[model samples]
Target: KIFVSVYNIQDETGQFKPYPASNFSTAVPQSATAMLVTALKDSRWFIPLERQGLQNLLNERKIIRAAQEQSLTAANIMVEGSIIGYESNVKSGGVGARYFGIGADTQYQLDQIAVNLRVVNVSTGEILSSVNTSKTILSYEVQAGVFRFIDRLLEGEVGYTSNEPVMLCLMSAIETGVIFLINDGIDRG
Candidate 1:
């Protein structure tokens, strides 16, 4: 198995936020690292080391050492990357109709995300390969309503949309990059 260490998968786009609001404060979601790890695990090609939470892993190792345990595994290859791009409202459109005081509409929005990954030979400190990949996220909404002027008036609307999560897109991009890296390595071999 290929032993690999993930140093960081940062959000370079600087668009990450805790919520839709709070524009001034931005932060990467906790799922980024986990998502990468999950992708790596699913690939069944590399043995990933826990470097993102080095301090915690070290602390646990210390406890084990104190209990007469030994050491943890090391990696021969290091992986690094970032969520480099996040384009919102890449494309959007909508349609609406009104007849006899009744109206209905449907709208859709598209967004995209990109990532870059690099692999390095830890022993030689040489870069092995780098790959970039991207994916799209789609969202949509629909609504219907009734407007009437008589003894009473009634109006109602309901809609639902599906959008891929940013983290999921990032993970997919990383997976694609990793596949490219593996293929390149094989070609060179």
Candidate 2:
């Protein structure tokens, strides 16, 4: 069975940041974990074991102790989870909306979401795959253009949501690719 263990790797320096303005109520990691699980619901590549199984395997003290009693049964695969940083900052870009308001003329916006992943060997405790992914959630400000200014003038819409999940599609693709490659390597060996 494909064992996927997720662990929150905390940034020692608090380097990873979350967007304060995003309306999403759930923590970023939680959302990401759920998203990833949903994305890999069905597939022929690996026998996706339930998350509970993985949790038990990873957390149960008895399981680790039992491994000592008998020949250890190593997992076929392991996935380690982590979140890096997600941020949204607004800044003045170019002149365009001056006709409406003095502050509206300048564009202000910057949003990004980044995540990292690592594959490990359960038996030998070796890292198999490592990837870092980051993408722009939203780059353009809503107040930079005349249309945006008008929209804002009528209904003060300012901040937007982060697209971290879709951006994390990159991580998913890499994961699947690595899974295939590893399988191929095992077969070849």
Candidate 3:
């Protein structure tokens, strides 16, 4: 049996300071685990929860809580992290959409997102394997008001810019989790 602890995250405390610190997001790691669940659905080498001990753990929150609080005798994997940065930029309609309204109006932006992930030996707090990923977003646009329109769309709906770094972090976590799961012998084929 393996146990994976959800990691809690926090952002840098300072406002506009040069270097800020951050905590972990408890939900993200669980979300990453859920993503792993989806990815492993089609993998033949891994035993599915429907066919194993995880059925209770997967369906019942109470059961999981009990296990977490009590003497749960399952193999456990814990996830934690430090968030460094997240940023992005975009540009549209420089010389591309001249046929519509504006001529070559180019806008470009970039974001620097950095983070570190570690696989630890839960008992000893020793890091077994660790990796860091930094993502950058680059785009160019040639249409009038396209950037503003997109910004409004994001702000109104999600209130955030959708960029490569966001996708990168999720994907990277999923990838690492998959590798960890497989290598840890959870894939009981």
Candidate 4:
């Protein structure tokens, strides 16, 4: 397995504030480093070392060393990059139907996110590969029907939509980057 280090993966666009922004708020709801590590682990292509939480790991290692001599794994490659783009309202539309007092309507919203991924040789600090990828997220609202009888009214709504998680999009981008690297390695080999 290729040993890999992920030191940083963050929101560089300055637009990744947590959704439903509130007072005393900063940063995205999801952690980029966690997402990257999860992606790498899921791919099973690289053995990721804990660089983002190195101090904690080092402290644990020290404890282990005190009990018995221990050694930590070294990384040969490094992965780094950032969430570079976040565009909301990329595309939106709606459809509706009405009959007397009964009506139905549906509305949708789209958002997109992009990530830049890079692989570097830890020993030489040379960037081996870099790739950028983007994915779309969607949300929808629906009103099924409304019924009115004199002063009384009844309304019902139902909707099914996928609001893509930012972390999922980030992982997709990272997977794309890894695919490129694998393809290139195969070609070169």
Candidate 5:
């Protein structure tokens, strides 16, 4: 009965900005839903459909208007969740000591992201299964400096940092939740 789009969803007027910007404005949107569908499909547990492009399907079907064609099936259960957890600093500790005018510093930090998924029976309005998964994002830095004792000072420094991608780690967290949810369903159903 209604259409959903960027312009339609954002309530604005005139040639200026509006109040409360949209979360999914332009190309900055992060759609975790698409990845979930792929993960569930890959598991071979649930059928996947174009949830975001249902309007396109409707138009295509309207174009044909065939007599013998059948309508697409609806889902038995509903999935509701998102990439809701993002923590930059979960825990970190470092120790550094300087000895004989020579010092080296080494440190590491740990970050965590959590994913939650719930499966609900649409008709019964009851949650059938739920799962939670967490992933670790690690970043470490190591640096060393040497200062020789002499009339002329000679110094050497080496810096290195290693970090894991947040988005990639998020992907794995989501997939892990889906797998756990599927396993729970198998045992419960």
Candidate 6:
């Protein structure tokens, strides 16, 4: 049942920025491993052990058995992956029409993220399936500002800006990668 242990998926992309209380520089989710594991479970193709929390699993297991040593599930297909690319503003466009300094405009931006997944045979250390998946983060904004004579007369702006979820993109990409791997595996065997 535990023939597959999904390893930690890393963020090799150097996308970074500063945030409060989060000592992380990576723009993508720091816990990509969780997303991949979730994907792994959804497909029912392999067993994803709590390897990252191995110590916790062992400690809890010991609490039950103590001296009655038991066996734990070993790994077979170990999947590893990384977010290799995150291109912000891959495409941007906007259209505006101002009539006497009073009009509405719309803008949109596209961001692309790429991930590479590799399934390895735990026993042989041979690569099984390697796949790449990419997804686009869509964002759009609408601005309606009115100013007959600029700020000197009285300026006002109102609109809403919406952005696609970054985590969601990664999640989709990881799931696709998993499916691609499974398909390739079936083809080869």
Give lDDT tens digits, candidate 1, residues 35-139: 777677778777878788899888887888889835578898888777778886888898999997888888898888888788888999998888888888778
On a 0 to 1 TM-score scale, where does candidate 1 land against the true structure? 0.84
lDDT tens digits, residue span 1-189, model 2: 355544333332233335675444433344444444444444434444445445565567577787879332434666555556655563324444454433353344555545665667777887776666555544443443333344444333344333335345434543454455455547544
Provide the overall lDDT of each model, using Cα atoms, as 2-decimal numbers.
0.77, 0.49, 0.44, 0.75, 0.66, 0.84
- My TM-score estimates for the predictions, one after another, are 0.84, 0.50, 0.44, 0.82, 0.73, 0.86
Least accurate 10 contiguous residues by lDDT in model 4:
21-30
Expressed as tens digits, the lDDT of each residue in 1-189 for candidate 4 is 678899988777676355586644533434777777877787786787978889998888789888874567899888888887877788988899999767878888888778878878888988887778777777787666666676765666565555667656666766776677666656654
Extract clashing residue pairs from model 2.
Answer: 91-108, 91-109
Runs in model 6 deviating more than 4 A are 18-24, 67-69, 148-156
How much does candidate 6 score in TM-score? Answer: 0.86
Q: What are the runs in model 1 whose C-alpha is more than 4 Å off?
A: 16-20, 24-30, 67-69, 149-156
- Pairs with steric clashes in candidate 6: none
Superposed on all Cα atoms, model 4 deviates from the true structure by an RMSD in Å of 3.0
For model 4, state the Cα shift of residue 72 in Å.
2.7
Predict model 5's lDDT versus the native: 0.66
Predicted model with the maximum TM-score: 6
How many clashing pairs does model 1 include?
0
Predicted candidate 6 versus true structure: per-residue lDDT over 9-54, tens digit per residue:
8888888755574556567877777888888787885777768878
Query: What is the full ranking by lDDT, best candidate first?
Result: 6, 1, 4, 5, 2, 3
